Every structure is written in C-alpha cells, then in structure tokens.
Structure 1
Amino acid sequence: VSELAGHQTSAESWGTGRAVARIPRVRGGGTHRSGQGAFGNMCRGGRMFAPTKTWRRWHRRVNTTQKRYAICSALAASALPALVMSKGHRIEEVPELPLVVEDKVEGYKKTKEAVLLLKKLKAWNDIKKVYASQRMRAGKGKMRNRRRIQRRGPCVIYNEDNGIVKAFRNIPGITLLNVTKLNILKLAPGGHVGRFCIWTESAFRKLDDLYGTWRKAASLKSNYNLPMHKMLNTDLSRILKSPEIQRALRAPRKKIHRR
C-alpha cells in the first residue's frame, strides 16, 4: 500500500465534549467529508492497520547442499512407477519408466515430429489429459492475468539444444529442461515429488558426472557427492519375517481380555 494512503488529509480530533467519539475528523468545510473521521484503521478512508511495506522479507535462501539434496530426491522418485502414477501421470503404457530416447530427437524442428514421438512412446495420453484439464481459474486471479489453468505434463530433459525446444514448446504441459541446469520447481511441481520425465540418451549419461556415484564424487560439481542413506534395507516387511528376528521374539499375546 502507498505510504501516503489515508494521511493526505489534515484532520484533528474535536476533543471531548461535543458528544462524538474522539476520533480525528476532517477540518470544516461545506462538503459531506466534513467532520467524518479521517485517520485510523476503523474509519472509512484513512489507514489500514500496519501498512504493508515493500521491505518485507520476500526472498528466502536455502543451503546449496540442501538444494542439491532435493534434486536428488526428485530424480530418484521419478524412477518409481508408483510415485509417478500417484502424481496423476497417465503412464500405464510407457515401455520403461526411466524413459530414455536416442539423441536424434534433439534434431527435431517441427511440432508435428514431436507429437508423433509422444504417440510412439505411449506418452500422448498424458498430454491428452492436459487438454482435458484446461479450464478457467476460480477467483480474483482471473482479473490478474492468471485466467486459464491446466495440468502439468511430462518433463523433457535434453543435454544440448538443436531445436528440440522449438519443437516441443507448443505442446501444452511439456516443460523442457537442460540437464545441467536442473530446476526443483519444475521437477517437483507443487512440492510433491514424482513428475514424469523423458530423458535423451546424451542427457542420461551425464547424470553420473553431475552427481556422481557413491564411490566417485561428481565431476561437474566442485565438491559434491550423493547423500548417504540412513538405512539400507528399507523393506521392513522382508526384515520382520526374517528368521534372525523371529528367533528372538516372545509369543504374540493376542487374546483379548475384556472387562
């Protein structure tokens, strides 16, 4: 709100007496706005309480290792089909989830070629689902240049660009990503993890140098290596019924004793 809002008037309380409510009022005159109550958040006109300032802390900073952590967790969830289904991506006919296509697709230069590719990869149904979600927003966002909303589609990750971006930017939902300059705001839209991604072969072979294996640090980051797991065997179903544990267990007391 502007710094002058509600203060451009010259008002003054009438003081006690005169049987009014002791709020600053507009000075004299032969108009309606004469002795009406000017300043103060409760008056018509006048300030709002605590005028919002521009020097509010808008931006936030996150630790660089925490940013790199999230991109590792985002990519690692893009390889689990149960997590990509749960994101709503219609991927029930994709041949293999970490979808990798040959580097020929970077040479594409016409949207007609790109849509034909998505049909062959059985990923068109995801884009066909984006069309079905094209509706207008609800609320004041419509009068603020946010009229139409839709669904996120598959994300295409390329290594280098020879026209693939021009060939795909017209398809709704598709977001192009350069493998080097990966973005967490586009790999995990809405904060939820599990966005369906499509890799090119040249981009797929560059991930072991952007993050490295556990026995080999990253070659493209100065000093970075994948985060360590807090537990190796997360399958606690296979753990509990393992013999090593069952021998060390008392008998399950499962007789209910009601009052």
Structure 2
Amino acid sequence: VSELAGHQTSAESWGTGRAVARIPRVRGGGTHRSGQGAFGNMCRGGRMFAPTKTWRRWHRRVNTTQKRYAICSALAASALPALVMSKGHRIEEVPELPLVVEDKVEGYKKTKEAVLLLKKLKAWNDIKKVYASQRMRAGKGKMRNRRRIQRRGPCVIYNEDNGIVKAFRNIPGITLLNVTKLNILKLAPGGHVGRFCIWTESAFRKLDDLYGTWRKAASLKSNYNLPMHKMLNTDLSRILKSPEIQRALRAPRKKIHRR
C-alpha cells in the first residue's frame, strides 16, 4: 500500500472540551470533508493499521539437499499406481507406470502427432479429464487475470527438445520438463506427491546419472547420492505375522471385562 496513503491530509485534533472525540479531524473548509476523522485506522479516509510494506520477506530459501530429497520423493511416487491414481490421474488403461517411450517423440513438430501418441498410450483420458475440468474461477482472481482454471495433466520428461515442446503445447494439461532441470513445483503440484509422467528413453536413462544409484555418486550433481532409508521393510504386515516375531509375543488378552 502507498506510503502517503492516509496521511496526505493535514488534520489536527480538536482537543477535548468540544464534545466530539479527540481524533484528528480535517482542518477548516466548507466541505463535507471538514472536521471529519483523519489518519486513524478506524476513520473513513484514514490509514490502514500497519500499512503493508514491500520489504516483507517474500522469498524463502531452502537447503539444497532438501530440495533434491523432495524431487527424489516425487519421482519415487510417480511410480506407484496408487499414488498416481489417488492424485486423480486416470491411469487405468496405461500399459506400464514408469511410462517410457521411444525417442522419435523428440521428433514431432505438430500437435497432431503428440495427441495421437497420447491416445495410443491410453494417456488421453487424462487430457480428456483436463478438458472436463476447464471452468471459471471463483471470485476476485477472475478480475485479475486468473479467470479460468483446470486440471494438471501428464508430465512429459524429455532429454532434449528436437521439436517436442512445440508439439505438446496446445494440449491442455501437459507440462514438459527437461530431465537435467527438474522442478518440484511441477512434479508434486499442490505439494501433493503423485503425478502421471511420460518419459523419453534418453531422459529415463539419464535419471541415474543425475541422481546417482545407491552405490554410485550422482556423477552430474558433484557431491550427492540418494537419501538413505530409515526403515527397509515397509510392509509391517509382513513383519508382524512373521515366524520370528509372533514366536515372541504373549497371547493376546481379548475378553472385554465390562463394568
């Protein structure tokens, strides 16, 4: 809000003794705006309490490994059909979930090709659902150039644009990434972890060179490896009804002694 906002008046308080109320009141004149109420956050005209400043700490800076950890986490759950389906993406009829494709797809220079591809791969019904979501936004962002809203679609990770990013462009829903420049804002939109992507074999090879396997450095991010796991056996149902453990448990007291 502007600096001068509210203070461009010259207004003194009629002190006590005049009845009225000790506010600074507009000085002199034969207008409506005379002996009014200036400056106070409560007055009409007035001046907002704690006017907003530009030097509010807008930007927010995050540790680099943590950023990478998130981006690994999103990738890891771009596998897992459950996490992709739960994130909404109609991935029912898709052939294999870390969906990787031939690298002619770098070639394509026309939406025609890019859509045909998506229909063969059965990824179109996500795009279809994007069209279905296209609707008007609720409220004031309508009058501030955020008027329409819709779904996020299939990600498409490419290794090099040989034409591709032109091809997939008008197809609403699609975002294109380079592998070498991935982004958590796009791999986990809403801060929500799953997301159906579509890999290019050239790009899908490059992932291990970028992120490093568990027994090999990144070899592309100088000093980095994957984050180690805290617990390895995630399925505790496989643990808890093992021989080794159930051997060593007292028998479950389960009678219900009511009052």
TM tier, smaller: over 0.9
**Counterpart of 2:85?**
85
Cα distance in 2, alignment partners of residues 39 and 72 from structure 1: 53
Deviations 1:8-64 (A, max 9, x none): 000000000010011000001000000001111000011000000000000000000
Tell me, what secondary structure is at the counterpart of 1:25? strand
1:132 and 1:95 mapped to 2: Cα distance? 23
**What SS does the corresponding residue of 1:105 show, helix, strand or coil?**
coil
1:176 alignment partner, SS class: strand
Partner of 2:70: 70
Whole-angstrom distance in 2 between the partners of 1:165 and 1:85: 26
State the secondary structure of the residue aligned to 1:221: coil
For residues 143 and 245 of structure 1, the distance between their equivalents in structure 2, rounded to whole angstroms, comes to 63
> Residues of 2 paired with 1:113 and 1:239: CA distance?
49
Query: 1-side partners of 2:84 and 2:66: how far apart?
Result: 23
- Identical aligned pairs, as a percentage? 100
Runs of 5+ consecutive residues of structure 1 not aligned to the other structure: none
Distance (whole Å) between structure 2 residues aligned to residue 246 and residue 146 of structure 1: 58
Aligned counterparts of 2:249 and 2:37: Cα–Cα separation in 1: 78
Whole-angstrom CA distance in 2 between matches of 1:218 and 1:43 = 61
Q: Using the alignment, how far apart are the partners of 1:244 and 1:11 within structure 2?
A: 84
Aligned to 2:197: 197
Q: Tell me, yes or no, if structure 1 residue 16 matches structure 2 residue 16.
A: yes
Which runs of structure 2 are paired with 1:23-172 in the superposition (5 Å)? 23-172=23-172
Q: How big is the shift at 1:244?
A: 0.2
Q: How far did residue 91 of structure 1 move?
A: 0.5
Following TM superposition, where does structure 1 have runs of at least 4 consecutive aligned residues deviating by more than 3 angstroms?
Answer: none
Tell me by how many angstroms 1:73 deviates: 0.2
Deviation at 1:99, TM superposition (A): 0.2
Q: Give how far 1:250 is off.
A: 0.1
**What are the superposed Cα offsets for residues 63-115 of structure 1, whole Å, 9 maximum, x if unpaired?**
00000000000000000000000000001000000000011100000000000
List per-residue Cα deviations over 1:177-207 (Å, max 9, x = no partner).
0000000000000000001000000000001
Alpha-carbon distance in structure 1 between the residues aligned to 2:173 and 2:255: 56
The alpha-carbon deviation at position 210 of structure 1 amounts to 0.3
CA apart distance, 1:225: 0.2
Task: Note the C-alpha offset of 1:172.
Answer: 0.1
| TM-score w.r.t. length of structure 1 | 1.00
Counterpart for residue 258 of structure 1 = 258
Alignment length (residue pairs): 259
Q: Which residue of 2 aligns with 1:247?
A: 247
Q: Distance between the aligned counterparts of 1:16 and 1:141, measured in 2?
A: 46
Alpha-carbon separation, structure 2, partners of 1:91 and 1:225: 30
Q: Deviations over 1:200-254 (max 9, x none)?
A: 0000000111011110011110100000000111110000000000110001000
TM-score, structure 2 normalization: 1.00
